[PDB]
Design a binder for this molecule. Structure first.
Ligand code: MG
Length: 225
């Protein structure tokens, strides 16, 4: 039933409040999603001035309900099944040899618009590390989101590793642990193990002088034959 909500282009709003090593900031995002093609187009603006962390570190936090699930896998799409009431998405993201983000989001429809409201807390970051030192490249992120059922919470868990390109040539690893639980009381689709193949392309609006990120992203479910 929630799947019916994604047959066309859906407007998206993202609102994030964050606190990382003593710096509070906010991000607002707007765009649209077309789950038929697993396609997201989003623009994010830091509304408090300059972002105190690199934009690439926020991509995964800033709507997996827009994934393209192949027809033969549609019974494994937890995310859309929870709609319109939505789900809570929580993560801990461990930046190797550095701090961590803990995030909590509610993803739900407000009328015809899919809304992602997030709070983020970052702690134990190194002042001269890759994150607070702004040493990460701005280009591309990709990975496989490995999803498994969480029957006890009528939801899912997921885990994945992001390799953030460092300006010197190296890698900043970000290990993601994820839990999603439905907001509503109704049945959801509890999936077999599978993954979301995700590719995010980061760019800038040449005319935009606010601190911002333009994102073109594709997300496709896979791993069931
Ligand atoms: Mg490189």
């Amino acid at each position: 039933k929630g799947e019916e909500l994604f047959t066309g282009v859906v407007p998206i709003l993202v609102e994030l409040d964050g606190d990382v090593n003593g710096h509070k900031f906010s991000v607002s995002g707007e765009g649209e999603g077309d789950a038929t093609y697993g396609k997201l187009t989003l623009k994010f603006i830091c509304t408090t001035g300059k972002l105190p962390v690199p934009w690439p570190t926020l991509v995964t936090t800033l709507v997996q309900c827009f994934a393209r699930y192949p027809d033969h896998m549609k019974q494994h799409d937890f995310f859309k099944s929870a709609m319109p009431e939505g789900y809570v998405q929580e993560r801990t993201i461990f930046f190797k040899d550095d701090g961590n983000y803990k995030t909590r989001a509610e993803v739900k429809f407000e009328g015809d618009t899919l809304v992602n409201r997030i709070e983020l807390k970052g702690i134990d970051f190194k002042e001269d590390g890759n994150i607070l030192g702004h040493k990460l490249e701005y280009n591309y992120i990709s990975g496989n989101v490995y999803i498994t059922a969480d029957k006890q919470k009528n939801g899912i868990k997921a885990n994945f590793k992001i390799r953030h390109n460092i300006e010197d040539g190296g890698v900043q690893l970000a290990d993601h642990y994820q839990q999603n639980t439905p907001i509503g009381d109704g049945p959801v689709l509890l999936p077999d193990n599978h993954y979301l193949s995700t590719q995010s392309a980061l760019s800038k609006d040449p005319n935009e002088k606010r601190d911002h990120m333009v994102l073109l992203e594709f997300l496709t479910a896979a791993g069931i034959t």
